[PDB]
Design a protein around this ligand. Structure first.
Ligand SMILES: Nc1ncnc2c1ncn2[C@@H]1O[C@H](COP(=O)(O)OP(=O)(O)OP(O)(O)=S)[C@@H](O)[C@H]1O
Ligand SMILES: Nc1ncnc2c1ncn2[C@@H]1O[C@H](COP(=O)(O)OP(=O)(O)OP(O)(O)=S)[C@@H](O)[C@H]1O
Ligand SMILES: Nc1ncnc2c1ncn2[C@@H]1O[C@H](COP(=O)(O)OP(=O)(O)OP(O)(O)=S)[C@@H](O)[C@H]1O
Lengths: 347, 337, 217, 260, 97
């Protein structure tokens, strides 16, 4: 019966079930496998259990004695599903770009959700935008707020999440996440800090000249090359502009680009009231003095400064926060800051 | 269990690992091999094979013990390689027209002249190296096969040369073909040699190309195009009137090809006819067609913001503000007249 | 790592760590370090563990590398001659004269030989008159390809030094080695990184009972 | 359990049992001395308390607040190791100077693949210190971004680096380390207290002014009083003149006027 | 250090084709390609003095492609003079003031 069929399928299997990546679709009941060291014979492939479901370059079950194709690999999962396969919205504290929000909207949601305009005005959707600037000003923050502000299930993909030194694990995660983006849904595969090709290295990593080079080749051929977009929103924002390979600076790969200054007085007071709200404010302290002195508050000093000001105060268990506590909080946060002459020597 | 015992009956054979080839000896072939990465193997095949079906640079079957060559296979297969503009950069058009059609159409202007049919171009240049090949596709006959030298950057010895023969003979099957190799800057024109033991598949591949392009069944009703951004690194082997013999070039057109491409991309989308281009042309200081196409895209972005159908020169005005002031580099022009 | 009685997961030197049983009679309080265990080839059955291994390639040279020299024999360095003499040969062995003025247990020292000198010659003279476990090396030997080669070199040097006897050891290379200029992102990123890291981490501030007073010049 | 190195046989790879690699290589120890040689440089110790015992002493006072605890103070400045070790040593339970700092290219990354194994230890060993010094760096920085955001055994543990700051400035984002505290060297008051301290045990020529010695130290790096004691005793081999000549060896260069 | 006595012993120059050496190279280009024999290479070589091989080679190829323009079967001294009087790798001018 069926139990006997399963017992026979197990009879075909050798107790030590090695693992070998398929090389090519050759269906004369034998394939050309590649185990952890690349055992590539014309080993038989079990016919009844699906022999042709898995593609070439995919892990399958292998024998030990003859390394025969034992079967399709088990359901494997990458360590990023919880971040990518997603189970703050527009703005919980309006007071920042107040515009790049709208622009990433028009560049991602409007194209993706209603792509009935690119034939309405002979146009093409933005296949890629880059957003960059200081180490935290409103680049990835907007993307995080855009994840909730969308009619689609966004995906979070840390640029370093794709750094696994296993053989082809780079291309493996490319394949997995892209089979997601294409055969899960029209998703929002957001990948940040993707500028990691320029001027550093790792200890938990081998020679990148020949380890992640073909990995990036696979990733590029996947995203904006072959098996092209269609409607697969995978936009690549950054922080820098320089250290990158111009193989993608050319359009097509990515079309638009956006930067991020640091917020202005109008937005300084905004994010102040956003953060200074977390404490019973001693209103005699002058936010505007902090705003003009710290006139280049990317967005970390504001948060850190107000949190540490609350800490300074509530160390004394006071409700109000005198100005000196704010001074100490900021100056601890704000090291190495000398904005006087120059200049410094004028008006 | 539809075949749960035949697989247990196919068992009598387990041989022929990957076993790539290196080269071969004489007085007996003695083909040289590496299995996967282990070592070099100057093997003697299993005589029940062909002394030539084991062409070096192929993963052939080979004994698990004696390493004698067995039933091969190239499981590396084909999936490795990926016009109203007639009249562009003006001078380029005539030389291109001649080099393409006149041998393809009338081997009399040269053969009787004794000069040779111009059948090659040393192009160098937003220039449009592909758009020219496509305006040619309007004219060769109807054949246009894209093979970019970038994809041609492959890391398998002879696989490049094997693709050379593949493309060269697929072209010779058809006629009036087009084969567009670019990034010869990335490919190389001067025969740089390093003891790195690396980029030599390019070496064998390019010698095979020299063999198979022109002469030895030349392109004829086929055009195989290797061109550059710059004639910077040439070689005394390419200036041959048989391989590449026109040496055209183009760069940024002033405004006329510009205006033309403006109108091209305009009618290519929902635009307002009452707009002009020479005004926009003055706005355009220096740009490639894609940049200009990007202006069109930004006009489309405005027409996505505001409900526009015939994209007006005011939509294009904002698009110009963007591309040439808000995208000239960033924004750093104003505050001094 | 050990799991049960006389059975332990033990790092190999062949390419495959294993979890093997050991000869039980071995004192159970001796299998704690990653020391030189010894097992059978196939069985991989631990027989005993050895403390030492992999000398520091000079191992004090152990013979009579003593240049057989007295005080004045050096080519005229009376300042350094007297200084090293009475501030080393007496303090190197002493416990109470320093304490007779509560001075301190001493540590490293420095020389510099220009044209027409002999600063190194003084070092070799002392190397004669020193009669303990002193090992000689050159800092130049710390710069190779792979990770931490020279760093691990000096590390194991420190280990074996504090192990054998905290008496004396010396190394001779300062220039292009002890480079205070950590600041150029062009060349020797990881190289100068590991160089100066080993330098400072082995400075340790000091260690106060080891390898008393290496010099350089 | 997932990610468990367990009992397996090369014979037929039939899994046998479950086993619970380089723990001690980092987890291996300085029960140091007291503050007896600190003498006036105690405000930084107060800050040490405020920023280290606050993640330790009374969690019920800022968990009552509800806001996250601090991770790093960047105890930088004029090179600190000695006393920064010997001071919270008095806790003798949480001061675990594992610090991963020695083996930059071996213990870090290439073995601290994800240092979360050490974070695992910390989750078992809430009384543990985390000292640090100088893209692997940026990788472990991302590890920090994952962990020290008010998330550890004592929720912040002890995640601090110290150096003496021109590396990759990404860490300089306070969202990765909250405090940044240089080490102001001792001065007249502190220098004089440590003067009496470092002159305590040596059987000097007692009855001697140490204030001029503290002053002659222009903000000496703490233990320099001990070194001057060493220089003094050497001259005597301890009158005030001994320490005078001691600083004279110590302080000279600065010298060489004719450039006023 | 590169030319003394055993490395590159002799050092002889390649003088510019004087007057009719240029025409010699030119007819070497102008021999296979079918030519109308009404081509005196003497006038050609004379009316372009101080003209190196390359120029002359570019001249004869220009003349070949010129007869190719009309589609001729022969090379006329008109086209030869056209090559002689081509850009000669000279430009442009603006001429700008
Ligand atoms: N609407 C907003 N516009 C601008 N800034 C905001 C806004 N809302 C919050 N912020 C602040 O901006 C910061 C966002 O920083 P992020 O860009 O998320 O940091 P990050 O992405 O880790 O930066 P790097 O480059 O990876 S170190 C937060 O700390 C907020 O305090
Ligand atoms: N001369 C032109 N005529 C018509 N369209 C053009 C022209 N130049 C650019 N374009 C358009 O602008 C886009 C630019 O593409 P390409 O010109 O292929 O880019 P490119 O980087 O110049 O290509 P290479 O490097 O020379 S192969 C194309 O999609 C064209 O449609
Ligand atoms: N008085 C001397 N008699 C014989 N050899 C001497 C004398 N002084 C120096 N030397 C030579 O110098 C070496 C020892 O002197 P060192 O102190 O090493 O010289 P130095 O100061 O390092 O100068 P360098 O290294 O040559 S630039 C020996 O190998 C001797 O050959």
């Amino acid at each position: 019966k069926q139990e006997e069929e399963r017992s026979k399928v197990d009879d075909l299997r050798g107790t030590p079930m090695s693992v070998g990546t398929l090389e090519e679709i050759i269906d004369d009941n034998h394939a050309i496998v590649s185990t952890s060291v690349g055992s590539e014979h014309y080993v038989s492939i079990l016919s009844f259990v699906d022999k042709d479901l898995l593609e070439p370059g995919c892990s399958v079950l292998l024998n030990h004695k003859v390394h025969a194709v034992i079967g399709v690999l088990m359901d494997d999962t990458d360590p990023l599903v919880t971040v990518m396969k997603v189970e703050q919205e527009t703005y919980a504290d309006i007071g920042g770009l107040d515009n790049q929000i709208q622009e990433i909207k028009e560049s991602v949601e409007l194209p993706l959700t209603h792509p009935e305009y690119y034939e309405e005005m002979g146009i093409k959707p933005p296949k890629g935008v880059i957003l960059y600037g200081p180490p935290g000003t409103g680049k990835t923050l907007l993307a995080k707020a855009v994840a909730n502000q969308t009619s689609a299930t966004f995906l979070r993909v840390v640029g370093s999440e794709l750094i696994q030194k296993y053989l082809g694990d780079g291309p493996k995660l490319v394949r997995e996440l892209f089979r997601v983006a294409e055969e899960h849904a029209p998703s929002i595969v957001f990948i940040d800090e993707i500028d990691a090709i320029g001027t550093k290295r790792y200890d938990s990593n081998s020679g990148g000249e020949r380890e992640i080079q073909r990995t990036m080749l696979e990733l590029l051929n996947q995203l904006d090359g072959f098996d092209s977009r269609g409607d697969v929103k995978v936009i690549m924002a950054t922080n820098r502009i320089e250290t990158l390979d111009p193989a993608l600076i050319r359009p097509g790969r990515i079309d638009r680009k956006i930067e991020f200054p640091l917020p202005d007085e109008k937005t300084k007071k905004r994010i102040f009231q956003i953060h200074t709200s977390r404490m019973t404010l001693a209103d005699d302290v002058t936010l505007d003095d902090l705003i003009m002195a710290k006139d280049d508050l990317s967005g970390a000093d504001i948060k850190a400064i107000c949190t540490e000001a609350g800490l300074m105060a509530l160390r004394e268990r006071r409700m109000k926060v005198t100005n000196e506590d704010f001074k100490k909080s900021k100056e601890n946060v704000l090291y190495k800051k000398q904005e006087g002459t120059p200049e410094g020597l004028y008006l | 269990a539809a075949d749960k015992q035949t697989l247990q009956s196919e068992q009598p054979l387990q041989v022929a690992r990957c076993t790539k080839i290196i080269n071969a000896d004489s007085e007996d072939p003695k083909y040289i091999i590496n299995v996967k990465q282990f070592a070099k193997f100057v093997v003697d095949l299993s005589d029940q094979v062909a002394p030539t079906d084991i062409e070096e640079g192929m993963r052939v079957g080979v004994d698990r013990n004696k390493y004698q060559i067995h039933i091969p296979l190239p499981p590396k297969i084909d999936p490795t390689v990926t016009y109203s503009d007639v009249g562009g950069c003006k001078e380029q058009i005539e030389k291109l027209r001649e080099v393409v059609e006149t041998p393809l159409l009338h081997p009399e202007r040269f053969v009787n002249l004794g000069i040779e049919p111009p059948k090659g171009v040393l192009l160098f240049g937003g220039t449009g190296k592909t758009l020219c090949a496509r305006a040619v596709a309007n004219r060769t006959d109807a054949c246009f096969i894209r093979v970019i030298g970038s994809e041609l950057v492959q890391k398998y010895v002879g696989e490049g040369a094997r693709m050379v023969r593949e493309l060269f003979e697929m072209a010779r099957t058809k006629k009036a073909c087009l084969i567009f190799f670019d990034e010869i800057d990335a490919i190389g024109g001067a025969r740089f040699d390093d003891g790195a033991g690396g980029d030599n598949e390019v070496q064998r591949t390019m010698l095979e190309l020299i063999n198979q392009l022109d002469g030895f069944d030349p392109r004829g009703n086929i055009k195989v195009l290797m061109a550059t951004n710059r004639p910077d690194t040439l070689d005394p082997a390419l200036m041959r009137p048989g391989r590449l013999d026109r040496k055209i070039e183009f760069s940024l057109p002033d405004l006329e090809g510009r205006t033309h491409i403006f109108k091209i991309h305009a009618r290519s989308m929902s635009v307002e006819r009452d707009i002009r281009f020479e005004l926009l042309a003055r706005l355009c200081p220096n740009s490639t067609g894609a940049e200009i196409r990007s202006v069109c895209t930004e006009a489309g972005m405005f027409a996505i913001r505001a409900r526009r159908k015939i994209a007006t020169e005011k939509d294009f005005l904002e698009a110009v503000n963007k591309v040439i002031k808000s995208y000239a580099k960033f924004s750093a022009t104003p505050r001094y007249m | 790592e050990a799991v049960d009685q006389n059975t332990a997961i033990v790092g190999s030197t062949t390419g495959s760590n294993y979890y093997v049983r050991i000869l039980s009679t071995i004192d159970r309080e001796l299998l704690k370090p990653n020391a030189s265990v010894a097992l059978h080839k196939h069985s991989n059955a631990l027989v005993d563990v050895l403390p030492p291994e992999a000398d520091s390639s000079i191992m004090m040279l152990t013979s009579d590398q003593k240049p057989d020299v007295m005080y004045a024999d050096i080519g005229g360095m009376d300042i350094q001659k007297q200084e090293v003499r009475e501030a080393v040969e007496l303090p190197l062995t002493h416990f109470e004269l320093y304490k007779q003025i509560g001075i301190d247990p001493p540590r490293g020292v420095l020389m510099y030989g220009p044209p027409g000198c002999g600063k190194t010659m003084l070092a070799k003279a002392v190397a004669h008159h020193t009669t303990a476990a002193f090992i000689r090396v050159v800092g130049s030997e710390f710069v190779q390809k792979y990770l931490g080669e020279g760093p691990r070199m000096v590390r194991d040097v420190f280990r074996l030094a504090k192990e054998n006897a905290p008496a004396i050891i010396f190394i001779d290379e300062i220039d292009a080695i002890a480079t205070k200029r950590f600041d150029a992102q062009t060349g020797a990123d990881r190289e100068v990184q590991r160089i100066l890291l080993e330098l400072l981490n082995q400075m340790d501030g000091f260690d106060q009972n080891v390898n008393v007073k290496v010099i350089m010049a | 359990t997932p990610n468990c190195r367990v009992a397996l046989r090369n014979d037929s790879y039939t899994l046998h049992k479950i086993l619970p690699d380089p723990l001690v290589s980092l987890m291996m120890k300085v029960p140091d001395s007291t503050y007896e040689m600190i003498g006036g440089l105690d405000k930084q110790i107060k800050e040490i308390k405020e920023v280290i015992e606050l993640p330790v002493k009374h969690p019920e006072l800022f968990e009552a607040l509800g806001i996250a605890q601090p991770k790093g103070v960047l105890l930088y400045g004029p090179p600190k190791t000695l006393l920064a070790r010997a001071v919270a040593h008095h806790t003798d339970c949480t001061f675990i100077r594992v610090s991963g700092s020695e083996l930059v290219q071996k213990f870090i990354g290439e073995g601290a693949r994800m240092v979360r194994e050490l974070f695992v230890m910390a989750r078992e060993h809430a009384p543990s210190i985390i000292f640090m010094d100088e893209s692997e760096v940026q990788r472990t920085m991302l590890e920090l971004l994952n962990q020290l955001d008010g998330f550890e055994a004592t929720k912040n543990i002890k995640v601090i680096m110290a150096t003496n700051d021109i590396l990759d400035s990404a860490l300089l984002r306070p969202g990765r380390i909250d405090r940044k505290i240089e080490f102001p060297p001792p001065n007249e008051e502190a220098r004089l207290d440590i003067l009496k301290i470092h002159s305590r045990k040596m059987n000097l020529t007692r009855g001697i002014n140490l204030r001029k010695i503290a002053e002659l130290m222009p903000g000496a790096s703490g233990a320099e009083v001990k070194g001057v004691c060493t220089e003094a005793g050497m001259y005597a081999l301890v009158t005030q003149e001994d320490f005078e000549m001691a600083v004279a060896k110590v302080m000279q260069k600065d010298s060489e006027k004719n450039m006023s | 250090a590169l030319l003394r006595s055993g490395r590159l012993d002799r050092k002889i120059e390649f003088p510019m084709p004087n007057e009719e050496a240029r025409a010699r190279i030119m007819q070497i280009h102008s021999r296979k390609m079918n030519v109308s024999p009404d081509v005196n290479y003497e006038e050609l070589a004379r009316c372009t003095d101080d003209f190196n091989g390359a120029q002359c080679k570019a001249v004869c190829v220009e003349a070949g492609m010129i007869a190719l323009r009309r589609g001729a079967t022969e090379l006329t001294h008109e086209d030869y003079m056209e090559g002689i009087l081509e850009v000669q790798a000279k430009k442009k001018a603006n001429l700008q003031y």
